[PDB]
């Protein structure tokens, strides 16, 4: 049941909407569904990371020391984050904190580097 749910969800995300269905299937098989509550750190700035996150429920706040924290933006269902530590250096460039009950579909580096990393929408992500 979860497998089909994951594939339908991934398809609905514009970044992933055009992937071959077998690649979507592989992603659905390797991802880990992870749950957070309000105020829980998902990512800390300056940590070293190896995971990519797709939000399937809730919202998160992104902040950065750029010594007090500054608010960058809020991300929500269908948005994703954590790609910068998978591009070149592995350092996290911002904090990501749950703003309510959150579900993320988590993709590790082993799968990301084959199935997602070649996507321009991810590799050339502007901000
Ligand atoms: N200015 C910003 N606005 C929104 N998201 C950001 C910003 N800077 C970094 N991020 C996201 O926060 C993530 C923190 O970990 P990564 O650097 O791996 O990937 C980062 C991006 O997904």
Curated annotation (Swiss-Prot):
Domain notes: Composed of an N-terminal leucine-zipper domain followed by an autoinhibitory domain, which mediate homodimer formation and inhibit kinase activity, respectively. Next, two cGMP-binding domains are followed by the catalytic domain at the C-terminus. Binding of cGMP to cGMP-binding domains results in a conformational change that activates kinase activity by removing the autoinhibitory domain from the catalytic cleft leaving the catalytic domain free to phosphorylate downstream substrates. Heterotetramerization is mediated by the interaction between a coiled-coil of PRKG1 and the leucine/isoleucine zipper of PPP1R12A/MBS, the myosin-binding subunit of the myosin phosphatase.
Function according to Swiss-Prot or TrEMBL: Serine/threonine protein kinase that acts as a key mediator of the nitric oxide (NO)/cGMP signaling pathway. GMP binding activates PRKG1, which phosphorylates serines and threonines on many cellular proteins. Numerous protein targets for PRKG1 phosphorylation are implicated in modulating cellular calcium, but the contribution of each of these targets may vary substantially among cell types.
Annotated spans, cGMP-binding, low affinity: 15-127
Known outcome of mutating residue 73 to A: Reduces cGMP binding affinity
Disease cited in the entry: Aortic aneurysm, familial thoracic 8: A disease characterized by permanent dilation of the thoracic aorta usually due to degenerative changes in the aortic wall. It is primarily associated with a characteristic histologic appearance known as 'medial necrosis' or 'Erdheim cystic medial necrosis' in which there is degeneration and fragmentation of elastic fibers, loss of smooth muscle cells, and an accumulation of basophilic ground substance.
Miscellaneous comment as given in the Swiss-Prot or TrEMBL entry: The 3D structures in complex with cGMP and cAMP describe the hydrogen bonding interactions that modulate high selectivity for cGMP in the CNB-B domain, and reveal that all these contacts are disrupted in the structure with cAMP, explaining the low affinity of the enzyme for cAMP and the fact that cAMP can only weakly activate PKG.
Residues of the full protein shown: 207 to 336 of 671
Name of the protein described by the UniProt record: cGMP-dependent protein kinase 1
Compartmental location: Cytoplasm
Membership in a protein family: Belongs to the protein kinase superfamily. AGC Ser/Thr protein kinase family. cGMP subfamily.
Residues that, per the record, bind 3',5'-cyclic GMP 2: 73, 82-85, 92-93, 127
Record note on modification: Autophosphorylation increases kinase activity. 65 kDa monomer is produced by proteolytic cleavage.
Tissue expression as described in the entry: Primarily expressed in lung and placenta.
Oligomeric form and interacting partners: Isoform alpha: parallel homodimer or heterodimer and also heterotetramer. Interacts directly with PPP1R12A. Non-covalent dimer of dimer of PRKG1-PRKG1 and PPP1R12A-PPP1R12A. This interaction targets PRKG1 to stress fibers to mediate smooth muscle cell relaxation and vasodilation in responses to rises in cGMP. Isoform beta: antiparallel homodimer. Part of cGMP kinase signaling complex at least composed of ACTA2/alpha-actin, CNN1/calponin H1, PLN/phospholamban, PRKG1 and ITPR1. Interacts with IRAG1. Forms a stable complex with ITPR1, IRAG1, and isoform beta of PRKG1.
Binding site for 3',5'-cyclic AMP 2: 82-85, 92-93, 127
């Amino acid at each position: 049941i979860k497998h089909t749910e994951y594939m339908e969800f991934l398809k609905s995300v514009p970044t992933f909407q055009s992937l071959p269905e077998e690649i979507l299937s592989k992603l659905a098989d390797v991802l880990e569904e992870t749950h957070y509550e309000n105020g829980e750190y998902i990512i800390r700035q300056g940590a070293r990371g190896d995971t990519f996150f797709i939000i399937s429920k809730g919202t998160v706040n992104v902040t950065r020391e750029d010594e007090d924290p500054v608010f960058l933006r809020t991300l929500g269902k269908g948005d994703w984050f954590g790609e910068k530590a998978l591009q070149g250096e592995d350092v996290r460039t911002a904090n990501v904190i749950a703003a309510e009950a959150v579900t993320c579909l988590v993709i590790d580096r082993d799968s990301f580097k084959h199935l997602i990393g070649g996507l321009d929408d991810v590799s050339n992500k502007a901000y």
